[PDB]
Design a protein around this nucleic acid. Sequence first.
DNA 1: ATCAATATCCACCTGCAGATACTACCAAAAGTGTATTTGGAAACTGCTCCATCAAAAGGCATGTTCAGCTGATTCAGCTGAACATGCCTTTTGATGGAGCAGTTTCCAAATACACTTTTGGTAGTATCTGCAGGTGGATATTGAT
DNA 2: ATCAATATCCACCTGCAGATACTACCAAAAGTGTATTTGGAAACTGCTCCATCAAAAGGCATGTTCAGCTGAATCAGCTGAACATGCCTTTTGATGGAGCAGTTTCCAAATACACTTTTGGTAGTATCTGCAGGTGGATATTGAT
Lengths: 82, 87, 97, 97, 95, 95, 106, 106
Amino acid sequence: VLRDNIQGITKPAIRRLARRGGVKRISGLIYEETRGVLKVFLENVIRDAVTYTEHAKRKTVTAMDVVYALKRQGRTLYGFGG
Amino acid sequence: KRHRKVLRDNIQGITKPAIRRLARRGGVKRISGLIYEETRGVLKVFLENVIRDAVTYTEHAKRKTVTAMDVVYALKRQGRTLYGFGG
Amino acid sequence: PHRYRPGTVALREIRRYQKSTELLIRKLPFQRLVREIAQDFKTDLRFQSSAVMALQEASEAYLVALFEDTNLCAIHAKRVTIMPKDIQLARRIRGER
Amino acid sequence: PHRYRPGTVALREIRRYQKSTELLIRKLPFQRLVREIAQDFKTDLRFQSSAVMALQEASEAYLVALFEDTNLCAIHAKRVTIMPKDIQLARRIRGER
Amino acid sequence: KTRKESYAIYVYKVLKQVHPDTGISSKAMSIMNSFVNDVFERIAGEASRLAHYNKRSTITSREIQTAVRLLLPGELAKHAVSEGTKAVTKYTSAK
Amino acid sequence: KTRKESYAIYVYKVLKQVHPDTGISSKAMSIMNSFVNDVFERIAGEASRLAHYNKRSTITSREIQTAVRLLLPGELAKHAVSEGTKAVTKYTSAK
Amino acid sequence: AKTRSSRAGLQFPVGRVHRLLRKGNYAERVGAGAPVYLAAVLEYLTAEILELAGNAARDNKKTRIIPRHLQLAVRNDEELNKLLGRVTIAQGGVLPNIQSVLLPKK
Amino acid sequence: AKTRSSRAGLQFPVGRVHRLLRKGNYAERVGAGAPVYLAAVLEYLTAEILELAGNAARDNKKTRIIPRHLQLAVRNDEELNKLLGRVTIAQGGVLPNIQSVLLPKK
DNA sequence: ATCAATATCCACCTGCAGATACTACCAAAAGTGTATTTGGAAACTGCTCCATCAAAAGGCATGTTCAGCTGATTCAGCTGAACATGCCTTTTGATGGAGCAGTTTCCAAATACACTTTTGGTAGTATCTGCAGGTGGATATTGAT
DNA sequence: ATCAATATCCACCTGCAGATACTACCAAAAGTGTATTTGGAAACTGCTCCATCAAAAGGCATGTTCAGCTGAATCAGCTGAACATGCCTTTTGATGGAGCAGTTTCCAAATACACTTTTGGTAGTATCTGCAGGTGGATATTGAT
Ligand SMILES: C1N2CN3CN1CP(C2)C3
Ligand SMILES: C1N2CN3CN1CP(C2)C3
Ligand SMILES: C1N2CN3CN1CP(C2)C3
Ligand SMILES: Cc1ccc(C(C)C)cc1
Ligand SMILES: Cc1ccc(C(C)C)cc1
Ligand SMILES: Cc1ccc(C(C)C)cc1
Ligand SMILES: [Mg+2]
Ligand SMILES: [Ru+3]
Ligand SMILES: [Ru+3]
Ligand SMILES: [Ru+3]
């Protein structure tokens, strides 16, 4: 059952996230749109995190690498160090 | 110094035509009558935030004069970096 | 023979989900998507367990909040249904476009 | 006796203003407003004249950008007329609230 | 093996003064730690900036105070300032 | 009559290289000067943090390089990295 | 020997704060009161959040503060919310809030 | 008797850039390659913008680059537009841009 | 209205994941006493440029008029919500091994210091030139008809 | 379509602002060279904690049905654009001093170095408990009628 990983982010899960966001009714085309948006978000943050990893001459992305990438993207996160 | 004129209601020097122009530069074709007061409000908030910070840098330096640089640093703090005035 | 009206379960879920804090995407699907994307940047990468969690926490918070703005954009246009244009408006105004 | 239809001069003005770079608010009025707001924070202040210019360049660029966002909120609502609610939608999405 | 520092115990000491019967989860403590580190960085960062703008080699409480005003919203700033000036007064007079 | 420094003459040299018959207004120069200072501070900042995160006391061209990849978007980063690498290699061999 | 914290009447480590400022390249030099002041500010802000998070724990019939309590504390206070306006508290969720136009008709 | 700039093949000033790095307290120590590499990046970026600004001046039949041309340069280029997405160029104006629905007829 | 299907509420119970408690420990900060280096208020004064006055350039305020936009009403049809569960993907837990992190080493490179030269700034007085803002004159755009 | 009122686009000109120029000079640079300090790569290695996978758990892909939302069509009322009109306010150019900003002396304060005392992170072993997750039954909510 060959399938892209992006599609593992399913309709029900995207529906749950919308719900926490106060959304009542959802157009059918939202799901592909949301996946798009999520992929761009992960690209930008992952790009930066990996860049921290490479710099530290490591092969493992640490939580700290992620936390720092989030900070500089203006999305400070609390609870994973630093 | 003798006497020091009272400043009041100056927000109103931001006239209807001046606000229309800024809307134009910003691509706006049609403007409801209520936009003008709303814009004055928004402008006033923006100015207080930047002046507060600017004046704070001035006082820290023990000066009486607000510099271009005080403003430029206040603008930077607020994520509205300005080029053209020494920073 | 008992059926809930359109929107009843929708409202019920909003209350449920606005009350809890669990992650709402399954861990595995998310993990693969992460590794996939990372591959385009460097090969032979490993991830700490807390690294992937941090990424999931951030992506869900980001998406939850964007659905707030999007919902406001739908409402502005006198609708109750979120559409791709509402997400697009939100992202454009946020300066992500 | 002659008249342009509503919207014709408006578009003419858009092209004109989008073409030039001069400050669109009168200098003295803008300067009194700065001095007033500052005086309310602290008395007996002076301003370098480029300080005032800085603020004015900053405020006009802020307001022009806000109007593009506002215009997009009106258009989203299938209107061509900007309203206070469009500005408010822009500022909330922008995280100015 | 290497010692990993944390504000965790000081946060915990302050918890007890404020709510002697109340505890804290690990995850919550880690958040609180981030909080202090973050605010630390924002304040020191602004202070550094100030010292540089004014051609000074030193960060004094004057720089921290102005930093606090710039960074904190209104009422939070005022109290923080008063807690700060307070701590310095008490500290000096003490032998 | 204190000496106020700027990147003005270097901006002007580079301008001659790319557009030999073109001039620059002083205002345009002022903006050019702000832009260089701006980029400078932003790269130095990222390099600073980076070093600290890695418990380093030294900022080397390796730190600058990563700061450039963090700060600049795609194609500008690729090219800027070439030029800086080129300059260092050439700098090393030139003594 | 007596700690600089106790001298200043503080639960927050003046010594550590002093050191962290030095090895932070914030400036060439560091005055004697700056760590004192800075540490007080941090203690202050911690207490503020801890109080309100405590209260949030109380409301939900709990004695153990969890991330959700910090989230409710911070976002229900105008000033704390503004300070942490570009910050994400892991495992905090959101404030219960439904746009009224979405409510069913009476 | 050779500058580090000529040694590296650069117009931008390596000495200056070395000096500014030290006094900015970015770290205890500054490596010898850092000002070299940084001065080159700076040179690169300023060449990139001047190229594009030069063209905007030429497109307007002008010989002197003014702030409007710098703004045309930056805003018309995807990458410089992003690098300066939170910056304002005094006296730069905006890009001519009218939304479709605003135009006459159908 | 009533009636009933189902969601929601509160109370009480219970095992253990995740909290507090604890002592050794030792190592590494933080604090204490001595000698050294350095920064920046205060005192003074040149001198830039800020505040504050009168004359000229044109933009603002206000009333009128009606074009066309907005927002209400209605309505057909499309589209997303709700629904039941076997089925297939994720979760939980079990176990080698990559690699990250701890430690020690030694040297290439960085800091420090002290003449030695070069250069980037300004200042004085001059000298050149791109273009903004005026004119008139030829071609587009717009709206009535 | 045709006519025509009005904006727009050229082109050409000319003062003069503001830009490029240059000659004198200099202090603060950057450069050169020699002495001494050390950061971090580099190499070995120990033990987490990460990938992998088998077994156990359980959320979701499916298609069918129709309530109720979205968006097109239509229209009246009235807001906001255009424009004419009278003139008030801003802009432009030329004359007084508060305060900024540059020099210097001098001590109050921070650095440094080495020393001596404790605090805070870990690990060890065990010690303790708040509450998520389950039960039962009473009451609220929703939807059919
Ligand atoms: C709104 N109000 C409160 N503060 C912000 N803005 C402008 P003013 C009045 C100070
Ligand atoms: C509200 N009031 C009471 N306390 C808390 N906050 C700020 P201040 C006034 C002290
Ligand atoms: C004094 N401060 C610290 N804590 C206790 N009290 C009341 P709030 C502010 C929390
Ligand atoms: C409404 C109002 C007017 C002025 C201010 C200043 C003092 C910030 C605040 C609120
Ligand atoms: C800033 C502020 C506001 C209120 C109070 C109360 C205690 C009177 C104190 C400080
Ligand atoms: C000083 C003070 C006391 C209480 C609070 C909370 C309870 C709002 C905040 C500051
Ligand atoms: Mg006032
Ligand atoms: Ru106000
Ligand atoms: Ru108060
Ligand atoms: Ru309180």
